């Protein structure tokens, strides 16, 4: 009950699905840059912080 001409339609459907998946999964989260997350990297320096203005 499934002719062989109907296969590439199914393949196209699944290609659309997996492409919709990979366009999201291709994205990734980079390194965090919030200073509040890294303030203790500077708090723990071997010298006190110079607020120079």
């Amino acid at each position: 009950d499934v002719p062989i001409e109907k296969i590439p339609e199914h393949a196209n459907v699944l290609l659309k699905k997996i492409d919709a998946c990979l366009e999201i999964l291709s994205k990734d989260i980079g390194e965090v840059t919030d200073a509040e997350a890294h303030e203790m990297y500077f708090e723990t320096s071997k010298f006190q912080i110079l607020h120079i203005y």
Partner: protein, 60 residues
């Protein structure tokens, strides 16, 4: 000493707490000198000597 105190600088709780046991050192320094020459009753020292040996009330 600079290394140790540069690390004390980085602490959060110990650098404000671990010094509170230090006055106790001076307490001992003062009380020891108070006790080196404290005048006491001869009768109580002969009747109740502190941690002296051969006191039967202690057991030995």
């Amino acid at each position: 000493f600079y290394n140790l105190y540069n690390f004390v600088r980085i602490g959060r709780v110990s650098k404000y707490v671990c010094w509170l046991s230090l006055p106790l050192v001076f307490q001992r320094m003062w009380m020891k000198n108070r006790a080196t020459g404290m005048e006491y009753d001869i009768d109580l020292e002969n009747y109740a000597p502190f941690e002296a040996k051969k006191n039967p009330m202690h057991g030995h």
